[PDB]
Structures are given as structure tokens and as C-alpha cells.
């Protein structure tokens, strides 16, 4: 476990993370994809061997000894708001199980379903709150990765408001 488990946010490419494992914002088919998924494919391509897994699940594949947790959020283009919200919660719960099983002291994590799976809506708060519900019972240091300057400020504010 971490000595004083924390949340932090950084605005940079998650493929350059300083944590003991990474969460990929994967597609269900284990394809290279776009955005976070394509950065993860370039950095850890070996982790895409048999990485396909259903929506609402996470599947870990090692790249050497470095764990890549492939977490499949719902595409809100296809899911109803109700069923998508349930699957997005479930994906983060499966991430927390994997992080616990691996015994890591730190994890790098993107906001699932906030990019091309957002169905054209701002889901910062929805996705971050499901991240917190799952990860609050874990003792890993959690480092959230984002790319937008305004999102960095809002995630930082949300972390600080609980402390
Ligand atoms: Cl960067
Ligand atoms: Cl996405
Ligand atoms: Cl972002």
C-alpha cells in the first residue's frame, strides 16, 4: 500500500506516467484504437495480446513486468444514459479489483468514456465520481491523467474539495 494514499492530477500523456501500472481506456476488441488507447499501443504493444474484454470489465496483460489494465467504458453513442452510467461505474469497480490483486502502490488512470465514447457530452464529473467510488477503498496512490487545461483545473478542484 502507499504510506498516505493520495489522489493527484497531471496534464500530460499517460504513456509517460511515473506509476507502477497503467489503466488503458480500451475498446472491447483489443484494437490499437485512438487517443489514450493508441498512445498505450505505441508504448506497450505486447500488452494487447488477448486483451479483448467486454464493456464494463477490465483485463490485465503484462508488458514485461509492467501491468496494463485494459478498462472498457461504454460508448454513450450506443448506450442509453441509464445503461451507460451503470457500465461506466462497473468498469471502474473492475479496475479497483485489478489494482488490488496486482499489489501495486500506484496507478495511472484516465477518465473513462470522456473522449470519443462521450456521445458528444461533457462527462468529467460523472466519470471522475465513478473513479472515486471505486478507488476510495484502495490504498494505491492514484494519478489521474488528462490533456485539457480547464479539465486539469476542475479535476484538481474536485480532489481538493474532499481534502
Ligand atoms: Cl506530454
Ligand atoms: Cl473515451
Ligand atoms: Cl482531457
Swiss-Prot record:
Post-translational modification note: Phosphorylated by host on serines and threonines.
Subcellular location per the Swiss-Prot or TrEMBL entry: Host cytoplasmic vesicle membrane
Reported impact of residue 13 to A: Partial loss of ADP-ribose 1'' phosphate phosphatase activity
Annotated Macro domain residues: 4-163
Binding site for ADP-D-ribose: 13, 27, 35, 115-117
Functional note: Seems to be essential for minus-strand RNAs and subgenomic 26S mRNAs synthesis. Displays mono-ADP-ribosylhydrolase activity. ADP-ribosylation is a post-translational modification that controls various processes of the host cell and the virus probably needs to revert it for optimal viral replication. Binds proteins of G3BP family and sequesters them into the viral RNA replication complexes thereby inhibiting the formation of host stress granules on viral mRNAs.
Protein name: Non-structural protein 3
Span within the parent record: 1334 to 1493 of 2474
Amino acid at each position: 500500500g502507499a504510506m498516505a494514499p493520495s489522489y493527484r492530477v497531471k496534464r500530460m500523456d499517460i504513456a509517460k506516467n511515473d506509476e507502477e501500472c497503467v489503466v488503458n481506456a480500451a475498446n472491447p476488441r483489443g484494437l490499437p484504437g485512438d487517443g489514450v488507447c493508441k498512445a498505450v499501443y505505441k508504448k506497450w504493444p505486447e500488452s494487447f495480446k488477448n486483451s479483448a474484454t467486454p464493456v464494463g470489465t477490465a483485463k490485465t496483460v503484462m508488458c514485461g513486468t509492467y501491468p496494463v489494465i485494459h478498462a472498457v467504458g461504454p460508448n454513450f453513442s450506443n448506450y442509453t444514459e441509464s445503461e451507460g452510467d451503470r457500465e461506466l461505474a462497473a468498469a471502474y469497480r473492475e479496475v479497483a479489483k485489478e489494482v488490488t490483486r496486482l499489489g501495486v502502490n500506484s496507478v495511472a488512470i484516465p477518465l473513462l468514456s470522456t473522449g470519443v465514447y462521450s456521445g458528444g457530452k461533457d462527462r468529467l464529473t460523472q466519470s471522475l465520481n465513478h473513479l472515486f467510488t471505486a478507488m476510495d477503498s484502495t490504498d494505491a496512490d492514484v494519478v489521474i491523467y488528462c490533456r485539457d487545461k480547464e479539465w486539469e483545473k476542475k479535476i484538481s478542484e474536485a480532489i481538493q474539495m474532499r481534502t
